[PDB]
């Protein structure tokens, strides 16, 4: 099991300045890092792949660099709309995993978002990932769980095509996963549910996450 530290929880920081957020691997992860800003109510968005691979869309001001241990993104010249969230995530082996996050701050509305339902401990319930705009059956999806304040967990993933599927063992009897190639849509049943299962969980594909399902017991 890989442990991705994050240096720290918060960091306080004011706009034009330049700040460093780093990450460390307790285990060589080679170059496989991504970073994630998540502003809140809101789905996590891609920043840096492959250590320092700036995604699509993602201004100069966000800089990825690190190898093998120590991680580093950083933020040129801060912005308002770069308050955020920050995480990092290594994908060199299972299961895949993410450092605790780090809010950046400085020194409005939000109605159902996302949605979800309400069940009971004991129950068990089946949330449902809809795909649309691209060939759903060459693109693996996983499923990350995210209770409030904490970090993010990866569940598992499941190859489309042929159903190949991988489980976190943490969850390898309580969560199950299917997909319906008929209609694009990624199903996971959860089982046996307890006060702990109550979270956000995602369903994502590489660059895109789900809006993600409220799931709460009581």
């Given at each position: 099991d890989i442990v991705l530290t994050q240096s720290h929880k918060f960091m306080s920081t004011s706009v034009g300045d330049r700040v460093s957020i780093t990450c460390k691997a307790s285990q060589d992860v080679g170059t496989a890092v991504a970073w994630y800003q998540q502003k809140?109510?809101?789905?996590?968005?891609?920043?840096?792949?492959?250590?320092?691979?700036?995604?699509?869309?993602?201004?100069?001001?966000?800089?990825?660099?690190?190898?093998?241990?120590?991680?580093?993104?950083?933020?040129?010249?801060?912005?308002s709309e770069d308050l955020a969230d920050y995480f990092c995530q290594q994908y060199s082996s299972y299961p895949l995993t993410f450092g605790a996050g780090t809010k950046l701050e400085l020194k409005q509305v939000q109605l159902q978002e996302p949605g979800?339902?309400?069940?009971?401990?004991?129950?068990?319930?089946?949330?449902?990932?809809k795909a649309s705009g691209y060939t759903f059956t060459s693109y693996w999806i996983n499923w990350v769980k995210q209770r409030p304040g904490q970090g993010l967990e990866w569940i598992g993933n499941i190859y489309?095509?042929?159903s190949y599927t991988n489980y976190n063992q943490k969850?390898?009897?309580?969560?199950?996963?299917?997909?319906?190639?008929?209609?694009?849509?990624?199903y996971m049943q959860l089982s046996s549910l307890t006060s702990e299962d109550s979270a956000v969980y995602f369903c994502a594909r590489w660059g895109y996450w789900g809006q993600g399902t409220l799931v709460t017991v009581s």
């Open positions: 809140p109510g809101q789905s996590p968005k891609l920043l840096i792949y492959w250590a320092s691979t700036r995604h699509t869309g993602v201004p100069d001001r966000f800089t990825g660099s690190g190898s093998g241990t120590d991680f580093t993104l950083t933020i040129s010249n801060v912005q979800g339902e309400l069940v009971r401990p004991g129950a068990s319930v089946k949330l449902s990932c489309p095509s042929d969850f390898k009897d309580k969560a199950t996963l299917t997909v319906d190639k008929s209609s694009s849509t990624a």
